[PDB]
Amino acid sequence: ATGDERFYAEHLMPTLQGLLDPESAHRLAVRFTSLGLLPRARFQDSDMLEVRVLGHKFRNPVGIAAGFDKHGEAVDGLYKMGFGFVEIGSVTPKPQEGNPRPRVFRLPEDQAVINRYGFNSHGLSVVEHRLRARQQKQAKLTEDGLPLGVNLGKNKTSVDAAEDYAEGVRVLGPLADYLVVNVSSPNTAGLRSLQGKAELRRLLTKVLQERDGLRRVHRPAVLVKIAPDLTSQDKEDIASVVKELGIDGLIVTNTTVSRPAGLQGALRSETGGLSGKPLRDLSTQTIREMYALTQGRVPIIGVGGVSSGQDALEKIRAGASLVQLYTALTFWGPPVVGKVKRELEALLKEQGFGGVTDAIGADHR
Numbered sequence: 001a002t003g004d005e006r007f008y009a010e011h012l013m014p015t016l017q018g019l020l021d022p023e024s025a026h027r028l029a030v031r032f033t034s035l036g037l038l039p040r041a042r043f044q045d046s047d048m049l050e051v052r053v054l055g056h057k058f059r060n061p062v063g064i065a066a067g068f069d070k071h072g073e074a075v076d077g078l079y080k081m082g083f084g085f086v087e088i089g090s091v092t093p094k095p096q097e098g099n100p101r102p103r104v105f106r107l108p109e110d111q112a113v114i115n116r117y118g119f120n121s122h123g124l125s126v127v128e129h130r131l132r133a134r135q136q137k138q139a140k141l142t143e144d145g146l147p148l149g150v151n152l153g154k155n156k157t158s159v160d161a162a163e164d165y166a167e168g169v170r171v172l173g174p175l176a177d178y179l180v181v182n183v184s185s186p187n188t189a190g191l192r193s194l195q196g197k198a199e200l201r202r203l204l205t206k207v208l209q210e211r212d213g214l215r216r217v218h219r220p221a222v223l224v225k226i227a228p229d230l231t232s233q234d235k236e237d238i239a240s241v242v243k244e245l246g247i248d249g250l251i252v253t254n255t256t257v258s259r260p261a262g263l264q265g266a267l268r269s270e271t272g273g274l275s276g277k278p279l280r281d282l283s284t285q286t287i288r289e290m291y292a293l294t295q296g297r298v299p300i301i302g303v304g305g306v307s308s309g310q311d312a313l314e315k316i317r318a319g320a321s322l323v324q325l326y327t328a329l330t331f332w333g334p335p336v337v338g339k340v341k342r343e344l345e346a347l348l349k350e351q352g353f354g355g356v357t358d359a360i361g362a363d364h365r
């Protein structure tokens with residue numbers, strides 16, 4: 001455990017990063033993971049890490065965020081890495097290449113990344129067939145407390161965003177435990193403007209109608225993923241629409257187009273979304289706000305700058321029922337998943353919580 005953790009963190013990852021540009025490193029990471037080339041995590045999930053939410057059991061509350069496995073190529077390897085749930089995507093209706101390279105940048109002095117991938121996607125059909133090939137295996141994983149999420153995007157050239165998302169619901173909804181719609185990615189022109197109210201209500205109404213039209217055993221939960229860059233007005237409006245329509249949950253947050261003071265990385269002024277440590281507390285505060293605006297009745301998946309048990313517990317106590325990480329993986333490697341789970345378990349005990357469920361939203365009480 002702590003042996004692999006230190007080896008990856010101090011030696012192997014700094015070396016990989018010295019040899020490989022970030023996008024090449026990402027591609028290699030997906031390849032290794034899809035082949036299961038990683039230590040089968042020794043950390044046995046204890047009962048106090050179990051969470052029941054979104055109509056499912058989650059064996060542990062630490063998931064892999066969208067954007068690592070964009071095309072559904074490494075799902076089983078990610079469960080092997082120890083994640084309690086996996087979110088693939090974003091997936092767009094038609095295949096598209098995304099932005100010109102370079103489009104991924106490391107800020108090692110900040111333990112941050114900036115990306116402007118631009119929703120590079122193999123497309124719905126390819127991903128549909130990839131998930132169909134392991135559909136029953138996933139059904140068993142889900143039953144064993146390891147659910148699957150699918151994050152849905154829209155094509156750059158799309159005329160009607162709601163129809164892109166509707167297509168995604170129809171094609172991948174039947175293969176997902178939950179679906180995600182972003183009103184929040186920084187690298188598709190106009191996508192975030194889907195955050196405005198009457199239009200947002202229209203969009204989400206259509207998504208939920210399409211979801212409700214699926215057969216019962218193929219009917220996923222629907223979550224909305226938001227950026228940390230919203231105005232107070234935006235957040236109020238989203239909370240209101242979410243409650244009005246019966247949206248099943250929120251993912252809080254995507255990357256930030258802000259550049260917090262104090263960034264040291266040479267590449268800090270590259271265009272794109274910033275992730276990792278400089279996002280951490282901006283994310284946590286957005287969770288805190290959305291939890292309060294929804295009266296703690298809307299499940300939140302908390303994400304942004306998590307790389308320790310303390311980071312995870314801060315988001316849970318702020319209102320998250322589950323958390324995700326991504327950027328920590330790119331600095332610490334696979335051992336970071338077991339690290340976060342072990343540290344989280346220890347902190348729950350230390351603070352007198354019977355388990356994760358007891359800690360959800362505890363700061364508000």
Ligand SMILES: O=C1c2ccccc2C(=O)c2c1nnn2-c1cc(F)c(-c2cc(CO)ccc2F)c(F)c1
Pocket residue numbers: 016017021022023025026027028029030032033037038039104106113329330331333334
């Ligand atoms: O800058 C980025 C980056 C930037 C943006 C997105 C992703 C990444 C990203 O994934 C990454 C970066 N630098 N290194 N990695 C990286 C992270 C890993 F976890 C592995 C890895 C290793 C093993 C060996 O057992 C097994 C499974 C693995 F995934 C890996 F090989 C490379």
Ligand SMILES: Cc1cc2nc3c(=O)[nH]c(=O)nc-3n(C[C@H](O)[C@H](O)[C@H](O)COP(=O)(O)O)c2cc1C
Pocket residue numbers: 065066067068070089090104113115117119151182185225253254255275276277279303304305306324325326327328
């Ligand atoms: C390289 C990269 C690609 C991403 N791609 C997506 C994506 O396709 N869809 C999405 O909803 N979020 C995407 N994200 C955002 C992550 O899901 C997550 O919300 C964010 O990175 C914050 O978590 P972290 O600080 O642990 O990385 C991406 C993030 C990174 C770093």
Ligand SMILES: CCCCCCCCCCCC[N+](C)(C)[O-]
Pocket residue numbers: 109110111112260261277278279280281
């Ligand atoms: C309140 C705005 C603050 C913006 C971002 C804050 C970053 C906190 C620094 C701790 C991160 C640890 N490290 C190694 C990456 O520097």
Ligand SMILES: O=C(O)c1cc(=O)[nH]c(=O)[nH]1
Pocket residue numbers: 067090115116117118119120182184185186187254255273274
């Ligand atoms: O594909 C991308 O550029 C991307 C999508 C998203 O939702 N978030 C992010 O940081 N990048």
Ligand code: NA
Pocket residue numbers: 134135136138139175176
């Ligand atoms: Na399935």
Ligand code: NA
Pocket residue numbers: 176177217218219220221
């Ligand atoms: Na389902």
Ligand code: NA
Pocket residue numbers: 231232233234
């Ligand atoms: Na405002």
